[PDB]
Ligand binder design. Structure first.
Ligand SMILES: Nc1nc(=O)c2nc(CNc3ccc(C(=O)N[C@@H](CCC(=O)O)C(=O)O)cc3)cnc2[nH]1
Ligand SMILES: *[C@@H]1O[C@H](CO)[C@@H](O)[C@H](O)[C@H]1NC(C)=O
Ligand SMILES: *[C@@H]1O[C@H](CO)[C@@H](O)[C@H](O)[C@H]1NC(C)=O
Ligand SMILES: *[C@@H]1O[C@H](CO)[C@@H](O)[C@H](O)[C@H]1NC(C)=O
Length: 207
């Protein structure tokens, strides 16, 4: 890994190399110029128990739309962003050889995600391991564990860092600081993560 810019991690759905995709579905639209995901992936990203991982958002009842939109974006960012190389790492697991860790998610992005999920429910603080997939999709391990979202995710930082086993590491930097990754951004103003990756790919460059 000498070049961590404009590259795609090696996961279950990513393409081998970045490339235009003017057919990406709604939320994944900001990545039409250059994406790591396919038209199909972006489409499935907006569906419940998608073809991607059969993940069920409604494990503790229907998750509020205002909250699911944040999980859909995360899917877009994770499955389409070509600016995550500075955080790519090899884990070697049944479904993905590589993945991202400690991505510096902007302070706001994490606080907004957290906020919009207050009215939602969940039974775990780690959505990567622990589910009961017997039914074909994940269901609560301990069915009686359902509680308000903030019960398992007390603070924004706990939600963004823990939920996806540390794929994120909420930064103190805010949107626009050029030092943090944004999962929400207006493509008409440009992709702000290009500059961020470049910055970090340099801080770890050389030695
Ligand atoms: N930012 C971000 N980072 C991620 O790592 C990420 N991962 C997913 C994929 N989520 C998941 C989580 C768990 C399982 C799952 O099947 N868990 C099983 C087996 C896990 C394994 O074998 O490694 C389980 O333990 O219950 C599948 C997809 C979606 N969005 C992400 N978004
Ligand atoms: C994405 O591709 C899979 C695999 O062929 C297919 O089952 C699924 O229906 C496709 N998504 C859409 C929305 O067509
Ligand atoms: C998983 O769910 C099934 C029901 O489909 C149940 O019989 C089994 O005891 C559960 N096991 C776990 C991991 O809690
Ligand atoms: C938090 O961000 C500040 C600048 O906003 C930086 O000085 C610091 O290294 C970061 N980490 C912590 C834990 O303060």
């Amino acid at each position: 890994r000498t070049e961590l810019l404009n590259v795609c991690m090696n996961a279950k759905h990513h393409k081998e190399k970045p490339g235009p995709e003017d057919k990406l579905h709604e939320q994944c639209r900001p990545w039409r110029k250059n994406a790591c995901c396919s038209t199909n992936t972006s489409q499935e990203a907006h569906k419940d128990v998608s073809y991607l991982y059969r993940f069920n958002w409604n494990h503790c009842g229907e998750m509020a739309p205002a909250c699911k939109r944040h999980f859909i974006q995360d899917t877009c960012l994770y499955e389409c962003s070509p600016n995550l190389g500075p955080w790519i790492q090899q884990v070697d697991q049944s479904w993905r050889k590589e993945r991202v860790l400690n991505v510096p998610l902007c302070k706001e992005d994490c606080e907004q995600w957290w906020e919009d999920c207050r009215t939602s429910y969940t039974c775990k603080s780690n959505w990567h391991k622990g589910w009961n997939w017997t039914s074909g999709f994940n269901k609560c391990a301990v069915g009686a564990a359902c509680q308000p979202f903030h019960f398992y995710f007390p603070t924004p930082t706990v939600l963004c860092n823990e939920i996806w086993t540390h794929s994120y590491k909420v930064s103190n930097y805010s949107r626009g600081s050029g030092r943090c990754i944004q999962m929400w951004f207006d493509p008409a103003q440009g992709n702000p993560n290009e500059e961020v990756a470049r910055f970090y790919a340099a801080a770890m460059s050389g030695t």
